Design an enzyme around this catalytic site. Structure first.
Site, PDB file in Angstrom:
ATOM      1  N   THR A   1      14.016  -2.270  -3.130  1.00 54.52           N
ATOM      2  CA  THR A   1      13.315  -3.521  -2.907  1.00 54.52           C
ATOM      3  C   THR A   1      14.312  -4.669  -2.989  1.00 54.52           C
ATOM      4  OG1 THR A   1      12.675  -3.678  -5.240  1.00 54.52           O
ATOM      5  CG2 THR A   1      11.116  -2.596  -3.765  1.00 54.52           C
TER       6      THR A   1
ATOM      7  N   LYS B   1      15.116   1.309  -7.195  1.00 58.19           N
ATOM      8  CA  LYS B   1      16.318   0.486  -7.363  1.00 58.19           C
ATOM      9  C   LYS B   1      15.994  -0.898  -6.800  1.00 58.19           C
ATOM     10  CE  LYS B   1      19.335  -0.797  -4.839  1.00 58.19           C
ATOM     11  NZ  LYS B   1      19.239  -2.130  -5.474  1.00 58.19           N
TER      12      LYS B   1
ATOM     13  N   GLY C   1      22.051   2.239  -4.119  1.00 63.02           N
ATOM     14  CA  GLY C   1      21.225   2.255  -2.920  1.00 63.02           C
ATOM     15  C   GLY C   1      21.780   3.165  -1.835  1.00 63.02           C
ATOM     16  N   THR C   2      23.098   3.123  -1.622  1.00 63.91           N
ATOM     17  CA  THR C   2      23.723   3.984  -0.624  1.00 63.91           C
ATOM     18  C   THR C   2      23.567   5.450  -0.994  1.00 63.91           C
ATOM     19  OG1 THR C   2      25.322   2.358   0.177  1.00 63.91           O
ATOM     20  CG2 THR C   2      25.977   4.650   0.293  1.00 63.91           C
TER      21      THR C   2
ATOM     22  N   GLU D   1      11.469  -2.164   6.175  1.00 65.49           N
ATOM     23  CA  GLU D   1      10.801  -3.471   6.158  1.00 65.49           C
ATOM     24  C   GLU D   1      11.908  -4.518   6.085  1.00 65.49           C
ATOM     25  OE1 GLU D   1       7.429  -4.375   5.780  1.00 65.49           O
ATOM     26  OE2 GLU D   1       6.573  -2.352   5.925  1.00 65.49           O
TER      27      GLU D   1
ATOM     28  N   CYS E   1       9.909 -12.932   3.788  1.00 64.96           N
ATOM     29  CA  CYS E   1      10.161 -12.229   5.044  1.00 64.96           C
ATOM     30  C   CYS E   1       9.320 -12.811   6.170  1.00 64.96           C
ATOM     31  CB  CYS E   1       9.873 -10.725   4.890  1.00 64.96           C
ATOM     32  SG  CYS E   1      10.680  -9.938   3.470  1.00 64.96           S
TER      33      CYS E   1
END
EC number: 1.2.1.31
Lengths: 509, 509, 509, 509
Positions: A162, A188, A228-229, A266, A300
């Site tokens: 997020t 995360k 994240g990766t 998203e 967003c």
């Protein structure tokens, strides 16, 4: 020095937060990675610290999450909803103090910090009933003595990355839906909203432990791009839900596709409001202002492009300027404030680059455009006129409170101008023309995932699926049948007859 | 020398085929690319020639398809269904001669060639009714005076890349569904089934032209990897439906993701049948044989891994050997034939390599394993015992009619053995145990897209969605709500009230 | 004297009709009841004869239909859809001659008679795809080791009683849907359209017999009230679909409820068009005329009440008068004819009674009101102004082509006036106001089963469910999930686990 | 003498109950009708009194409820769901004392009294999410420039008549669903559970009052047949949900059909359990006992007919006898009690008459058959063998705990025997045969509304729709799309185009 050590912020302890907090939860709390300090964007003061996940923390967490799934996937969906129902109540019990943390660490105003917690509460109450509804049809097989059923099963482990701007609600949509669908979750969140992630996880962890369920069902590994990766490359993360920038989201999408995983993307929006000649201008101006400056323009779905018919362009721009002049700026927790700080100092710098680039591309700043000389990451909400609809700074977008205003004459060109950008999240027309409204909703209308009429670009409720098209990534969250993204479909034919297949000349025994 | 010039194959002219055929259709027929000759695998004789698409052909076709989409998207879906209904009838009138072409150019037996055309007819008849049903719900908005609707619109251009083994039906599923959803189509079939692509396009083009509609609604650009890759990279291709190998599909999927397009991936299968001790062997043995040797083992859903409980392993293998020896081999258009040639001579060499490789990994050939002494690409349907379930040839595997037989003892290990391969298309258990059946269908059961009980791995009808998980790519075709992949969802909030936003302390005019 | 013996009507023989026709079909043709002669309302000439059902004919037909159901219900729904697909084609091949019979025996104009056959054709094509979709959801049980599925199965024998005014389409809607749902049908049409009933049955009987199916799946027992009353009281008639008058339908519903059967009631309408001040009058005037005078005002959905805003009332009425004067009256099969005869001679007498009663009740006849001096049952399409909205003749409503015109001022009173009658079938408003449009569709809007905007009261397609509320009976036909009225729902829990119940203190064995 | 005045029952005051209670609630409390005293069936001691509704009370209550509906129907459904959620929480908070009242006034044991309240809690939580989902599809119109939508709107006033045996849950199922669908409710419970009706209504009234909503949204008019009959004849009652006897329900259905209202009928069951030779007896025996003697045999879903295959009949009966002897009898609130009193002394007399008739019809009482010598309406749970499946006392069936045991040999005859009774609520087979299970669910299987496999006849959860067929009345409550019975469907066509109808020659202005 830390805000949490000052008596005026003693309410932070109501969320179980302390000076240095464990940023890894998997049934146990830990964190061997780098210790991060998060700062209040309203005054640049340090709040408290979070111990982030090392690689070993992540590895152990993924493993415990998958072990927990064996128990969780065996629990009937309605009973998983009961757990989500109790999460909803646990958030309710802390809604005021949690919203205050959102306003404090992230920087949006109190009604929106609280509003975000409410959004999580609502999706839980929705998911409780949905947990008795998820499934597929029994279809009539064309074969005698055969049954044809569509089954839905959890994908397993749902990684959820997020972003900073909605550090509670986005996770909550993913969590409530993923959980009733029988998945375990690994979160995360954005590093600069780590305390919010910890506080939420503390609320969920209590519910799970009170029900004697493994905490890794809702795991947390605080971290940055490295964690994240790893999630994006990890074959053990069956579905990776990513909310963030298009640039990062593109790389996440590619890594998940490389290993034949599932992604739910998203990403950014470059959202347009279109005001036609027949529009209710007493509705256009406030809708435009609030959609543009709300959350310091960091949604967003923030309105970034305002198209006005030529006949009313000058009037709407003048009416916006006078209404912008009354935006009340201040600390986001102060009750009379409408407009708080940007989330980071880097964002302030990007805002300046965008304003100056817009000037270089021929734009005119008719309101705002300067950093405010005051503590925190405050910039003036800005309006830029005179650019062509295809100006480069308008197409790429920034995450700054800059409203680009354009003129148009006819419906066909402006529908195209709405559709010409790479992003495709939200869109709004203001008009009274019945036919124009349905054309807008049709195949030659808006190409976005959210297509609004006489409500600005941030109009969305949990009942519908939330997400966009094109460079917004294609994922959907929350309502309608968005839950199917968190499950795998199987088409199942059951032969229950004693019918043996035709021998076709073969003599069996 | 060309079969189409020989009087015994004069029926080919009933499909409009000639000695040299145009392989590009976009309202006009053409083809400035390389001329390909396709061959009959039953006798290795050339059939006829097809002029493939040059790059300029492809460019001209995409443009014409997108121009035609403006017309097609304005036609109400029920009226698009009427076009699809007439395609259904046009295929009906040609089912025998078209199916014969499938047998000749691809090599599967006549009942399967005709059966494949029947599938296209059936999905057309299905799509007629679906064209009055596609759409989304009207949802009850939480805001007074607002409507909340979920709308569905075409994505635009649906690129369809198909493979050799089902050169009619896979296109038909995508075409019938994409068309009623308001999309235009661009077909690139397998080069070695170019005559089939042309003949199918000839049938559709007449219907389109007969209804005074632009032929580019169903465009065709015959070509190989270069044309397919262009489609994968073409931002004007909104949805790329790809059916083919896992190796190619992975690169196709990555290219579409790179440009934030949509992909629908129907990749390889490594499908397993599991026979438990309580299974009806009079059903297991024929089901295993027909699922293994059908289409000379060249289906995506071909049975490749046969797990038999130890108690019945020797008996089931012995019964399979006696049944395999009675398989009738011949020309695929001969009605007595159950078993035709492999599609290419290269596949024959690969068959030999796989048999030899299975011996190297410790396997025993208990039936078959050799090329047949006859013209054409005929190899013996083969059964291999003795391999471990984790043997390399068992996990990757080829497109050869080789059935790998394994022993197992208990239910949980063999469910995991089913799930342990990278692919996840089809799967079948044979058992009478009620609980075992539902566990197979449940979250700890089969991980495949098709999960069957007492019917082999090829059990699939158009009413349900067809496709697999994991390295099978995740796409779905045909039934249920697979049509949503061919459309874009929008969540639409319409404010129809005279209400204004709250002033929030600002004076508006 | 009979029209079927005159050479200009020889086309009747193309439908298999003769001088005297059997009106009972149950696999074999017969009729031992009273012989009825039906008449052409355009000239009052007798057409042909039909031998109706005796009691014993009815007894034998019900028994054979119930016997045939054992076979029909075992046939997979998609294969039942294939039969319905062929029925659609059989109707297609005779659409012109059948539509001509509708014009000759019933009296509506040729394009509408043809159109009615098309309606049956269209519902067949719709039902084909629907036959692969009917069913219910698999739901997530709250109990471990349990499945919860909703099943749908045929009710058995569906009696279908239809009326004169739509003597093909209403039966067809019921037939195609009831058939794909696994039911057998028993049809009793309006006696005065017996030839149409016979002709339709001959087309279906041929399809059933060609497919080697028992003809009683689509049985016919021509008759009047005596047969309908028998069907209403017959416990062997599992669902009774009755289309007809409110008076008769009320007694049928009571008789079916008395024996705990199922009824589907399609009764009268007293439909209103409401024209607001902002309406496009170039749309109102043609729409009002065609919905009022179409089918000489003998549709269930005929516009009988025209509410016009006071500001535009006189202009709309005057434009309506000038337009009525151009309506072309003639033989219903003669081309360019827009207006045919009333169905019966009694209908002429009721028209006259209604006109004089409207005058006595304070109304003014501004156009028409007289019988036309010409062969057949022709009366002038009539406009009556000056009545109060609650005038008794306006609330009861005859089946005559009389349009009652009223004034209104505000939205709330005229919505209430739409809803104030006992019927609740069809309704339309003409306006451009977005908010009024959605209020019309909402809980304070129209109370009818069909609620239209800027299109008249006859706007209805097969994709939606057709039927009304209040005294219209509540039934639905054709689209959406109207099929569930033809099936019985079961909620099914399958314990597939080895889990024994809680002993609750009892020592079980 | 009144139990509520004894200190051991002071807990009754926690529900707002007093010596004499108002039995009318419409926003205010009252009751001018006859005062009824309800008694504890375990000791025939008086509990408290309730002032019932007079005709004038009923009139006033309907009028206020209809006024309240104008406010209620304008509240967005999700916000109506928020009200239902709070009702669920308010029931949660009183679950123990309310469950105790259900045990005290009705006579079922405490765990079931609590369980009944829990069921209402669950339907509320289910309805919260459902309030964001109810609605219909947007359909694709066949006419260009037209929209086709299916709308659902409340029916208005929902009358709810409930029976003694489920005096909370049945109302709760109807209430929670009716409310989110925008209806108001008027409750008339069984006279003998008047304290329960008042207590529940007090819980709901507080929630409505706290939310500043008119209390008549959940109105109460305590009364017997006279008030119930008034509701059935009242055109102001748009939907009458009736749960009770078949005899009364038949008259209620006729009265509602006479006025073209809506009814939802939940009448008696005469339910069968079928044990095949292959069934797990360790599952059959407890399942039969609990389904037969639970709630002293007073459920609509009570097992009243036990069919056992000949081979296992004697063993099951003997195992049933040994288990019945361990059924623990006592006061329904006494801990660990499994079996309480019948609701009335009349039920004891009907029990005794049924036992003597069954013996006179050739049956043998192998256990029970006698009144217990103790205070209250206690009778022995009874098992009767030796009767034919069509014995008269077995087809009629009292509401007494008498289990009739029958033998069978073959699947087809015992399926027919399940279906041969007039009622059709619940049914169960115990077997492991896969094909038999699917045949049982199919068109030739059980004809009941609930069709269970290896779980007894009381197996039902809120996720599915609950109700029966045949003389059970056909209504459904609770799950799936049962909400549609509480709403009216409209098919709405919106012409948003500027297109005008075909002139058809007429010259319009």
């Amino acid at each position: 020095t830390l805000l949490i050590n000052q008596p005026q912020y003693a309410w932070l302890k109501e969320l179980g937060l302390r000076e240095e907090n464990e940023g890894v939860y998997n049934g146990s709390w830990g964190g061997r990675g780098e210790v991060i300090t998060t700062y209040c964007p309203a005054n640049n003061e340090p709040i408290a610290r979070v111990r982030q996940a090392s690689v070993a923390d992540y590895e152990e967490t993924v493993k415990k999450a998958r072990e927990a799934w064996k128990i969780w996937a065996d629990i009937p969906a309605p009973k998983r909803g009961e757990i989500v129902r109790q999460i909803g109540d646990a958030l309710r019990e802390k809604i005021q103090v949690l919203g205050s943390l959102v306003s404090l660490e992230m920087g949006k105003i109190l009604v929106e910090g609280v509003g975000e917690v409410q959004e999580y509460v609502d999706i839980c109450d929705y998911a409780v009933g949905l947990s008795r509804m998820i499934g597929g049809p029994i279809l009539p097989s064309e074969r005698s003595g055969h049954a044809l059923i569509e089954q839905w099963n959890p994908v397993g482990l749902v990684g959820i990355i997020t972003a900073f701007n909605f550090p509670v609600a986005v996770y909550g949509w993913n969590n409530a839906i993923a959980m009733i669908c029988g998945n375990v979750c690994l979160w995360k969140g954005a590093p600069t909203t780590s305390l919010i992630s910890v506080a939420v996880t503390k609320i969920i962890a209590k519910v799970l432990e009170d029900n004697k369920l493994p905490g890794a069902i809702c795991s947390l590994t605080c971290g940055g791009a490295d964690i994240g990766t790893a999630m994006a490359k990890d074959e053990r993360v069956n579905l990776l839900s990513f909310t963030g920038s298009t640039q990062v989201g593109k790389q996440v999408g590619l890594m998940v596709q490389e290993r034949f995983g599932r992604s739910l993307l998203e990403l950014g929006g470059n959202n347009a409001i279109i005001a036609f000649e027949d529009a209710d201008l007493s509705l256009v101006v406030p809708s435009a202002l609030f959609a543009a400056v709300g959350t310091a323009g960091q949604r967003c779905t923030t309105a970034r492009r305002l198209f006005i018919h030529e006949s009313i362009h000058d009037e709407v721009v003048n009416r916006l300027k006078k209404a912008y002049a009354q935006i009340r700026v201040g600390n986001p927790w102060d009750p009379n404030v409408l407009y708080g700080p940007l989330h980071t100092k880097q964002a302030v710098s990007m805002f300046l680059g965008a304003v100056e680039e817009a000037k270089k591309e021929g734009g005119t700043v008719v309101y705002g455009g300067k950093v405010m000389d005051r503590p925190g990451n405050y910039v003036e909400p800005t309006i830029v006129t005179g650019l062509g609809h295809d100006a480069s700074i308008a197409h790429t977008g920034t995450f700054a409170p800059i409203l680009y205003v354009f003129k148009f004459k006819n419906e066909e060109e402006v529908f195209a101008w709405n559709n010409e950008v790479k992003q495709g999240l939200s869109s709004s027309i203001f008009t009274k023309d019945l036919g124009r409204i349905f054309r807008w909703l049709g195949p030659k209308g808006s190409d976005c995932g959210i297509v609004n009429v006489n409500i600005p670009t941030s109009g969305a409720e949990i009942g519908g699926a939330f997400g966009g098209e094109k460079h917004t990534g294609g994922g959907r969250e929350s309502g309608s049948d968005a839950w199917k993204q968190y499950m795998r479909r199987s088409t199942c034919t059951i032969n229950y007859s004693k019918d043996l297949p035709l021998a076709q000349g073969i003599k069996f025994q």
